[PDB]
Design a binder for these strands. Structure first.
Lengths: 37, 135, 123, 175, 133
RNA sequence: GUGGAAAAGGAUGUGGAGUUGCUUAGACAACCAGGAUGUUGGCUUAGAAGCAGCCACCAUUUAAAGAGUGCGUAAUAGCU
RNA sequence: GCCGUGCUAAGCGGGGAGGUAGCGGUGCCCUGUACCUGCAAUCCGCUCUAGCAGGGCCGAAUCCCUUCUCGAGGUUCGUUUACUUUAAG
């Protein structure tokens, strides 16, 4: 995870999922997994 | 590092800002411009940092077209002194910016790279900001 | 969208002077099969046969309504179109029959294509 | 581009019934599955024809209208044929075998790991490494498969432990 | 099926090819005599050989024409061509030599015609900047 | 639990008003097929052939193959 | 070619958990009776596989290849002792 209040897709394989009140991202590369707040 | 080489009076009032800019309401000299929406002070270091951001990302261009120059000096007292006993020393220079002011102009660079350069440099200024193109 | 109309009307101009045609199904497009088929039709005959594959119902009915209203069976799926102006095929059709039956994929066991009148057993 | 208003059909010999307003019970050749929904949905059963009907088309009504047809269709082929998840295990000494009505694992641990199926969902060992779970409901089969994987999740450096049939795992080089 | 660009210099030892010949299931030394007999017809060149194993465990070896721009280095007089594209142009090759090079690969290529073949050699020669006269 | 405390910034949250290409001569997705040849692009690695880069931006029948976006010790695989 | 005069060099250990479809090496066992300093393992010389600088070699091959060996280790089985740790009875 990367808990950062700025979440944007690093690579083009990332897609954003609006989950539980915190807009996460999910990608095949686990380094690109982050969630705000 | 933008410096007026001579000023009449090196200390002057802080001034008040209200209302839109008198001039510079439209991008006229380049083809893509950037606009202020909120009025505040912008310093030498902020102008210089934005110019380094634009020039170093674009690595090419006709020219950079800075559209504002800081003339107002602002003063500071030395640290931890009892307040009073005369106005402090001049510390730096400030360009006063009202809303509807084009800050930077760009000519000769294409669409998305101009958009990326102006976003990358508008992130380095304290004021809310909008892109604009020339009619 | 009118470029579709230009390619339609030039294919109508082709098929009006076209005398003969041969059923080829555009599935199972393996490279060695299609290169050997194209090289052997280069050996057999001229280059007049086409590689055009688009078989939507706006194309086949528009080709059929001027001439040859038997394209309802060739409406679905994908059928390449071959145009033959020079020499009446017979040994060429037997060549197509033999290289379809002795492996090297099938043709649907002769779907048939209306040269002037042909539905069954193009040989 | 719509999955909600498409038509689904009972393939053969699978009985369906509506005993309460939004509780549907389906008995196929394998067994019986019964589920309950909120009453805003509407289901009608013609002979080998099932139709779904929503009162209004809005943000979450569209979601529930799509997912109820997907759910009912998925459970009717599940009660038709059953469903399979296979699990491989990669390792030079890793073993998994069948003990009665239970499944025993020994992968790395001093104690063996016991899995006790209770819901009539079968686990079989065709080989020492390959194991299969076969069941009626996709939710329960996936839950049991995830429960087996959580005993040892696969590790990135050497491909080891429990994994699914054909999925890819990340390869990290250790020096 | 596997491909091996066997030169006429040496086909015997293990450091050049090794397991590529070893893992095919055919004896390596048992066909080196046939490889040398096929190579001596075109000796002084690098012949590609395709080794194919059928379902009946039968091994077939097919030799082909050498790759393009092999004789272009000999026509230039320099073994290694110019690695900088299209501004260092030393090899000035006549169209008669271009036609001969195309004619040597009339059977091997899948190009339509001699015009397609000279387009092929233009597309190859434009990478290292070889002048075609 | 906004109401009932607060910013630069981030987002397929949502309600309104517009603009713009495809829009049944069948779109976006889904599934089934196609993925080659010169050519293993050079030349330092006798290893690189997409696995670093001086580097082109060809032609074949293709409206499909770009000298290439991807498991891969370095090519060779169900693969995109 | 009997041999003699001024001079040499290929070369002066390998195998078996090893590393690149790559040899040498700073564990381990061996015959050693075959030389010394440095670089070289979350590594270096380096590619007909020779580890890289010099010298101690009469000096050319009995030391470059061929039954010329079993043996000093890497092994699906060891039901043939027996010990030791967790448990179906």
């Amino acid at each position: 995870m990367k808990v950062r209040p700025s979440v944007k897709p690093i690579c083009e394989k990332c897609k954003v999922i609006r989950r539980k009140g915190k807009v996460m991202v999910i990608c095949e590369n686990p380094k690109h997994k982050q969630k705000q707040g | 590092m933008l410096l007026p080489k001579r000023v009449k009076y090196r200390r002057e009032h802080r001034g008040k800002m209200r209302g839109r800019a008198k001039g510079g309401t439209e991008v006229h000299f380049g083809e893509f411009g950037i606009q202020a929406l909120e009025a505040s002070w912008i310093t030498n270091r902020q102008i210089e940092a934005a110019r380094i951001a634009m020039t170093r990302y674009m690595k090419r261009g006709g020219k950079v077209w800075i559209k504002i120059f800081p003339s107002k000096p602002y003063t500071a007292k030395p640290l931890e002194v009892r307040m009073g006993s005369g106005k402090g020393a001049p510390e730096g220079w400030v360009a006063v910016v009202k809303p509807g002011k084009v800050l930077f102009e760009i000519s000769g660079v294409s669409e998305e790279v101009a958009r990326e350069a102006l976003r990358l440099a508008s992130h380095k200024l304290p004021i809310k900001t909008k892109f604009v193109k020339r009619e | 969208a009118i470029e579709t109309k230009k390619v339609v009307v030039e294919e109508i101009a082709s098929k009006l002077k076209e005398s003969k045609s041969t059923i080829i199904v555009d599935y199972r497009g393996l490279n060695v099969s299609e290169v050997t088929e194209l090289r052997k039709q280069l050996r057999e005959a001229n280059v007049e046969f086409k590689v055009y594959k688009n078989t939507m119902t706006r194309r086949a009915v528009e080709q059929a309504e001027l001439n040859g209203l038997n394209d309802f069976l060739t409406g679905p799926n994908a059928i390449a179109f071959s145009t033959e102006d020079v020499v009446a095929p017979a040994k060429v059709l037997n060549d197509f029959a033999k290289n379809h039956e002795a492996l090297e994929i099938k043709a649907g066991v002769i779907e048939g294509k209306v040269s002037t009148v042909e539905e069954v057993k193009a040989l | 581009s719509r999955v909600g208003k498409k038509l689904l059909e009972i393939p053969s010999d699978v009985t369906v019934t509506l005993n309460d307003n939004n509780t549907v019970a389906v008995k196929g050749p394998k067994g019986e599955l019964t589920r309950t929904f909120h009453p805003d949905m509407e289901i009608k059963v013609e002979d080998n024809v099932l139709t779904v009907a929503r009162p209004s088309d809005q943000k979450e009504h569209r979601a529930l209208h799509g997912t109820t047809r997907s759910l009912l269709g998925n459970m009717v082929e599940g009660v038709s044929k059953g469903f399979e998840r296979g699990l491989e295990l990669v390792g030079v000494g890793y073993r998994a075998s069948k003990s009665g009505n239970k499944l025993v694992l020994n992968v790395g641990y001093s104690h063996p790991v016991e899995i006790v199926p209770e819901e009539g969902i079968e686990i079989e060992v065709p080989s020492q490494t390959k194991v299969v779970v076969k069941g009626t409901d996709k939710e329960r089969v996936g839950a049991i498969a995830a429960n087996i994987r959580a005993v040892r999740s696969p590790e990135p450096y050497k491909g080891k432990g429990i994994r699914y049939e054909g999925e890819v795992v990340r390869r990290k080089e250790g020096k | 099926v596997v491909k091996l660009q066997i030169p006429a210099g040496k086909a015997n030892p293990a450091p050049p090819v090794g397991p590529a010949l070893g893992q095919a299931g055919v004896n390596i030394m048992g066909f080196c005599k046939e490889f040398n007999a096929r190579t001596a017809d075109q000796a002084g060149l690098i012949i590609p050989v395709e080794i194919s194993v059928y379902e009946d465990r039968s091994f077939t070896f097919i030799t082909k024409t050498p790759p393009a721009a092999v004789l272009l280095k000999k026509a230039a007089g320099i073994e290694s061509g110019s690695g900088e594209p299209n501004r260092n142009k030393v090899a000035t090759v006549k169209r008669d030599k271009v036609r001969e090079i195309a004619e040597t690969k009339m059977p091997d290529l899948n190009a339509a015609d001699v015009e397609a073949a000279m387009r092929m050699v233009e597309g190859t020669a434009r990478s290292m900047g070889i002048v075609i006269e």
